[PDB]
């Protein structure tokens, strides 16, 4: 299984600033970490963030020696960066792809980021 | 509200016990709840309560400066296996006095596996 030894921390930032969130997890094998995001307002749903997202303002750096560590950074914040950021970790062999054995659950830990003008 | 410590996944034995811990900050000091979802595509997340499962589940919390909460489970059985979720919020409407603006609580999860 996979478990968190550090969760990302909620924070309030300013339009034009930056934010950095950190996540750490253990397991054997060493788990993979992904970052996911959900905006405000009942239209928005959780989707995966990727290195280079949002016009290359989002950056993800990860290492996997002995334990999983991952940092997500966002340049030059705008208001719509506001929302819930979620770190997910798993060492399930089928987590990528499958096959209709349909469904690895990743453990999740959340931080809310509020961007004010 | 944010977490400064999430619960940690662990593997235990039928007949054993487990203890999960959660810590969160905010101002006002946020409330913490624990929720649980079993394995197998039938199961959905539901709130755990102090005394649950025939009084095998106990929840102790304190809210001075920061929110700290511990859930303990006595005498484990296989169906205690699943995902345990700590939720935290300091939203004034979270104990949802009908007022229809749907508070989101921040969540942090640990998986507990109970093997025979």
């Amino acid at each position: 299984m996979a478990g968190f030894v550090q969760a990302p921390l909620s924070q309030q930032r300013w339009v034009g600033g930056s934010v950095e969130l950190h996540c750490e997890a253990v397991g054997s094998p060493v788990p993979e970490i992904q970052w996911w995001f959900e905006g405000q307002g009942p239209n928005d749903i959780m989707s995966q963030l990727w290195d280079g997202a949002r016009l290359d303002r989002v950056h993800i750096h990860a290492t996997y020696h002995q334990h999983a560590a991952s940092t997500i950074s966002i340049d030059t914040l705008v208001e719509e960066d506001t929302g819930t950021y979620e770190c997910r970790a798993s060492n399930d062999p089928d987590r990528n792809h499958l096959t209709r054995a349909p469904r690895v659950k990743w453990v999740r830990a959340q931080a809310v980021v509020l961007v004010l003008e």
Side-chain angles (χ1 to χ4, degrees), chain A residues 56-88:
Chain A
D56 224 347
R57 275 164 24 239
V58 173
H59 312 283
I60 302 169
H61 167 77
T63 62
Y64 300 98
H65 306 296
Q66 308 304 333
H67 74 294
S70 185
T71 296
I72 184 167
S73 308
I74 311 183
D75 307 330
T76 322
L77 300 166
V78 294
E79 274 182 54
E80 28 280 306
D81 292 328
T82 288
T84 304
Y85 293 76
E86 170 170 293
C87 173
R88 304 187 176 181

Short mmCIF file of all heavy atoms in Angstrom, two decimals, chain A residues 56-88:
data_model
loop_
_atom_site.label_atom_id
_atom_site.label_comp_id
_atom_site.label_asym_id
_atom_site.label_seq_id
_atom_site.Cartn_x
_atom_site.Cartn_y
_atom_site.Cartn_z
N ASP A 56 2.61 26.72 -19.30
CA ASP A 56 3.93 26.49 -18.70
C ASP A 56 4.17 27.27 -17.41
O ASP A 56 5.31 27.65 -17.11
CB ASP A 56 5.07 26.73 -19.70
CG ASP A 56 6.14 25.64 -19.65
OD1 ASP A 56 6.13 24.84 -18.68
OD2 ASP A 56 7.00 25.55 -20.56
N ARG A 57 3.11 27.51 -16.65
CA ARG A 57 3.24 28.13 -15.33
C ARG A 57 3.30 27.08 -14.20
O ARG A 57 3.75 27.37 -13.09
CB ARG A 57 2.08 29.10 -15.10
CG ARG A 57 2.38 30.47 -15.69
CD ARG A 57 1.15 31.32 -15.83
NE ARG A 57 0.10 30.93 -14.90
CZ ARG A 57 -1.11 30.54 -15.29
NH1 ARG A 57 -1.38 30.52 -16.59
NH2 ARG A 57 -2.04 30.19 -14.39
N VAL A 58 2.86 25.86 -14.51
CA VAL A 58 2.86 24.78 -13.55
C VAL A 58 4.06 23.86 -13.77
O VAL A 58 4.30 23.40 -14.89
CB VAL A 58 1.58 23.96 -13.67
CG1 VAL A 58 1.65 22.71 -12.77
CG2 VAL A 58 0.36 24.80 -13.35
N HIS A 59 4.81 23.60 -12.69
CA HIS A 59 5.97 22.71 -12.77
C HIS A 59 5.94 21.64 -11.67
O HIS A 59 5.62 21.92 -10.51
CB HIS A 59 7.26 23.50 -12.70
CG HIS A 59 7.29 24.69 -13.61
ND1 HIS A 59 7.50 24.58 -14.97
CD2 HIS A 59 7.11 26.01 -13.37
CE1 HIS A 59 7.46 25.78 -15.52
NE2 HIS A 59 7.24 26.67 -14.57
N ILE A 60 6.28 20.41 -12.05
CA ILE A 60 6.26 19.28 -11.14
C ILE A 60 7.61 18.57 -11.09
O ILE A 60 8.10 18.05 -12.10
CB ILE A 60 5.13 18.30 -11.49
CG1 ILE A 60 3.79 19.03 -11.45
CG2 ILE A 60 5.11 17.10 -10.52
CD1 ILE A 60 2.62 18.24 -12.04
N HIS A 61 8.22 18.54 -9.91
CA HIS A 61 9.48 17.85 -9.75
C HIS A 61 9.32 16.73 -8.74
O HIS A 61 8.90 16.98 -7.61
CB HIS A 61 10.60 18.82 -9.32
CG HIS A 61 11.84 18.14 -8.83
ND1 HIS A 61 12.76 17.56 -9.68
CD2 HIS A 61 12.29 17.90 -7.57
CE1 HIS A 61 13.73 17.01 -8.97
NE2 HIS A 61 13.47 17.20 -7.69
N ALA A 62 9.66 15.51 -9.15
CA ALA A 62 9.56 14.34 -8.26
C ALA A 62 10.81 13.44 -8.21
O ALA A 62 11.56 13.33 -9.17
CB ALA A 62 8.33 13.51 -8.63
N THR A 63 11.02 12.81 -7.06
CA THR A 63 12.09 11.84 -6.89
C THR A 63 11.53 10.61 -6.19
O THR A 63 10.58 10.71 -5.41
CB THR A 63 13.27 12.39 -6.06
OG1 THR A 63 12.82 12.72 -4.75
CG2 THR A 63 13.86 13.65 -6.71
N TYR A 64 12.12 9.45 -6.46
CA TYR A 64 11.61 8.20 -5.95
C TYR A 64 12.69 7.27 -5.41
O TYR A 64 12.66 6.07 -5.65
CB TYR A 64 10.73 7.48 -6.99
CG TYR A 64 9.53 8.28 -7.44
CD1 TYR A 64 9.55 9.01 -8.63
CD2 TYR A 64 8.36 8.31 -6.67
CE1 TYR A 64 8.44 9.74 -9.05
CE2 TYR A 64 7.24 9.05 -7.08
CZ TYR A 64 7.30 9.76 -8.28
OH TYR A 64 6.21 10.48 -8.70
N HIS A 65 13.62 7.83 -4.64
CA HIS A 65 14.59 6.99 -3.92
C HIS A 65 14.16 6.72 -2.47
O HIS A 65 14.11 7.64 -1.64
CB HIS A 65 15.95 7.66 -3.94
CG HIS A 65 16.42 8.01 -5.32
ND1 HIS A 65 16.69 7.05 -6.27
CD2 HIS A 65 16.66 9.21 -5.91
CE1 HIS A 65 17.07 7.64 -7.39
NE2 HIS A 65 17.06 8.94 -7.20
N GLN A 66 13.85 5.47 -2.18
CA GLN A 66 13.39 5.06 -0.85
C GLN A 66 11.99 5.55 -0.51
O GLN A 66 11.20 4.80 0.07
CB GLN A 66 14.38 5.47 0.24
CG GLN A 66 15.81 5.02 -0.05
CD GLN A 66 15.91 3.52 -0.26
OE1 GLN A 66 15.11 2.74 0.26
NE2 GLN A 66 16.91 3.11 -1.03
N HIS A 67 11.67 6.79 -0.86
CA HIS A 67 10.34 7.32 -0.59
C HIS A 67 9.94 8.23 -1.74
O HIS A 67 10.80 8.66 -2.51
CB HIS A 67 10.28 8.07 0.76
CG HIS A 67 10.95 9.42 0.75
ND1 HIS A 67 12.30 9.57 0.58
CD2 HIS A 67 10.44 10.66 0.94
CE1 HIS A 67 12.60 10.86 0.64
NE2 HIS A 67 11.49 11.54 0.85
N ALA A 68 8.64 8.49 -1.86
CA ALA A 68 8.15 9.37 -2.92
C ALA A 68 8.05 10.82 -2.42
O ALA A 68 7.39 11.08 -1.42
CB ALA A 68 6.82 8.87 -3.44
N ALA A 69 8.69 11.75 -3.14
CA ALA A 69 8.62 13.18 -2.85
C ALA A 69 8.26 13.94 -4.12
O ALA A 69 8.83 13.67 -5.18
CB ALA A 69 9.98 13.71 -2.30
N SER A 70 7.35 14.89 -4.01
CA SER A 70 6.89 15.63 -5.17
C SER A 70 6.51 17.06 -4.82
O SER A 70 5.80 17.31 -3.86
CB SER A 70 5.70 14.90 -5.83
OG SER A 70 5.30 15.54 -7.04
N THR A 71 6.99 18.00 -5.62
CA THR A 71 6.70 19.41 -5.44
C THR A 71 6.01 19.98 -6.67
O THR A 71 6.50 19.81 -7.79
CB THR A 71 8.00 20.20 -5.18
OG1 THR A 71 8.58 19.74 -3.96
CG2 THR A 71 7.73 21.68 -5.05
N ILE A 72 4.89 20.67 -6.47
CA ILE A 72 4.27 21.40 -7.55
C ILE A 72 4.39 22.91 -7.32
O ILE A 72 4.08 23.40 -6.24
CB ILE A 72 2.80 20.99 -7.74
CG1 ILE A 72 2.19 21.71 -8.95
CG2 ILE A 72 1.98 21.27 -6.47
CD1 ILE A 72 0.87 21.12 -9.39
N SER A 73 4.87 23.64 -8.34
CA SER A 73 5.07 25.10 -8.27
C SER A 73 4.24 25.78 -9.34
O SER A 73 4.10 25.27 -10.46
CB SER A 73 6.54 25.47 -8.52
OG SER A 73 7.41 24.74 -7.67
N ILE A 74 3.70 26.95 -9.03
CA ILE A 74 2.90 27.68 -10.00
C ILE A 74 3.40 29.11 -10.08
O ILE A 74 3.44 29.83 -9.08
CB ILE A 74 1.41 27.63 -9.65
CG1 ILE A 74 1.00 26.19 -9.37
CG2 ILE A 74 0.56 28.17 -10.79
CD1 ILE A 74 -0.46 26.03 -9.09
N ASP A 75 3.81 29.52 -11.28
CA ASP A 75 4.30 30.88 -11.50
C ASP A 75 3.16 31.85 -11.66
O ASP A 75 2.07 31.48 -12.10
CB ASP A 75 5.15 30.95 -12.78
CG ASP A 75 6.26 29.92 -12.82
OD1 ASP A 75 6.78 29.54 -11.74
OD2 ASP A 75 6.62 29.49 -13.96
N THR A 76 3.41 33.11 -11.30
CA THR A 76 2.57 34.24 -11.71
C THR A 76 1.09 33.97 -11.56
O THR A 76 0.36 33.87 -12.55
CB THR A 76 2.89 34.65 -13.18
OG1 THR A 76 4.30 34.54 -13.41
CG2 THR A 76 2.44 36.09 -13.45
N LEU A 77 0.64 33.87 -10.32
CA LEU A 77 -0.73 33.42 -10.03
C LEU A 77 -1.85 34.32 -10.59
O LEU A 77 -1.72 35.55 -10.62
CB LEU A 77 -0.94 33.24 -8.52
CG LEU A 77 -0.03 32.24 -7.81
CD1 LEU A 77 -0.13 32.46 -6.33
CD2 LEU A 77 -0.40 30.82 -8.18
N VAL A 78 -2.95 33.70 -11.00
CA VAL A 78 -4.17 34.43 -11.33
C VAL A 78 -5.28 33.89 -10.45
O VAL A 78 -5.12 32.84 -9.81
CB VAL A 78 -4.56 34.25 -12.82
CG1 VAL A 78 -3.50 34.90 -13.74
CG2 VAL A 78 -4.77 32.77 -13.18
N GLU A 79 -6.40 34.60 -10.41
CA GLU A 79 -7.48 34.24 -9.51
C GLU A 79 -8.00 32.82 -9.74
O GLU A 79 -8.37 32.14 -8.79
CB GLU A 79 -8.63 35.25 -9.61
CG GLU A 79 -8.46 36.45 -8.70
CD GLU A 79 -9.62 37.42 -8.78
OE1 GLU A 79 -10.78 36.98 -8.59
OE2 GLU A 79 -9.38 38.62 -9.03
N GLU A 80 -8.03 32.39 -10.99
CA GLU A 80 -8.61 31.08 -11.31
C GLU A 80 -7.68 29.91 -10.96
O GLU A 80 -8.05 28.74 -11.14
CB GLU A 80 -9.05 30.99 -12.77
CG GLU A 80 -8.28 31.89 -13.71
CD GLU A 80 -8.76 33.34 -13.67
OE1 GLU A 80 -9.97 33.57 -13.86
OE2 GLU A 80 -7.94 34.24 -13.44
N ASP A 81 -6.48 30.22 -10.48
CA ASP A 81 -5.64 29.18 -9.87
C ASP A 81 -6.23 28.78 -8.51
O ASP A 81 -5.83 27.77 -7.92
CB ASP A 81 -4.19 29.64 -9.69
CG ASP A 81 -3.46 29.83 -11.02
OD1 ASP A 81 -3.74 29.08 -12.00
OD2 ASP A 81 -2.58 30.71 -11.09
N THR A 82 -7.19 29.57 -8.03
CA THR A 82 -7.88 29.28 -6.77
C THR A 82 -8.60 27.95 -6.86
O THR A 82 -9.28 27.67 -7.85
CB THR A 82 -8.94 30.36 -6.44
OG1 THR A 82 -8.28 31.57 -6.06
CG2 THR A 82 -9.89 29.91 -5.30
N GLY A 83 -8.46 27.12 -5.84
CA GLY A 83 -9.19 25.87 -5.80
C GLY A 83 -8.53 24.84 -4.93
O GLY A 83 -7.67 25.17 -4.10
N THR A 84 -8.92 23.58 -5.13
CA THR A 84 -8.40 22.49 -4.31
C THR A 84 -7.36 21.69 -5.05
O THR A 84 -7.63 21.15 -6.12
CB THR A 84 -9.54 21.54 -3.87
OG1 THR A 84 -10.54 22.30 -3.18
CG2 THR A 84 -9.00 20.44 -2.95
N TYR A 85 -6.16 21.62 -4.47
CA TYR A 85 -5.04 20.85 -5.01
C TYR A 85 -4.88 19.53 -4.27
O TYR A 85 -4.85 19.47 -3.04
CB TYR A 85 -3.74 21.67 -4.99
CG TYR A 85 -3.81 22.84 -5.95
CD1 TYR A 85 -4.54 23.98 -5.63
CD2 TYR A 85 -3.18 22.79 -7.19
CE1 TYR A 85 -4.61 25.05 -6.49
CE2 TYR A 85 -3.24 23.85 -8.07
CZ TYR A 85 -3.97 24.98 -7.72
OH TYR A 85 -4.07 26.04 -8.59
N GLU A 86 -4.77 18.46 -5.03
CA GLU A 86 -4.81 17.13 -4.46
C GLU A 86 -3.64 16.29 -4.90
O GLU A 86 -3.43 16.07 -6.10
CB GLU A 86 -6.12 16.47 -4.85
CG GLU A 86 -6.19 15.02 -4.52
CD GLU A 86 -7.58 14.46 -4.72
OE1 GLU A 86 -8.50 14.85 -3.96
OE2 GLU A 86 -7.75 13.63 -5.63
N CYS A 87 -2.88 15.80 -3.93
CA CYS A 87 -1.80 14.86 -4.18
C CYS A 87 -2.36 13.43 -4.10
O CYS A 87 -3.09 13.11 -3.17
CB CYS A 87 -0.71 15.05 -3.11
SG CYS A 87 0.58 13.85 -3.19
N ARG A 88 -2.00 12.57 -5.06
CA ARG A 88 -2.46 11.17 -5.06
C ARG A 88 -1.26 10.24 -5.17
O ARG A 88 -0.35 10.50 -5.93
CB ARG A 88 -3.39 10.90 -6.24
CG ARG A 88 -4.60 11.80 -6.32
CD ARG A 88 -5.52 11.30 -7.44
NE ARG A 88 -6.75 12.07 -7.49
CZ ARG A 88 -7.74 11.85 -8.34
NH1 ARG A 88 -7.65 10.88 -9.24
NH2 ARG A 88 -8.84 12.61 -8.30
#
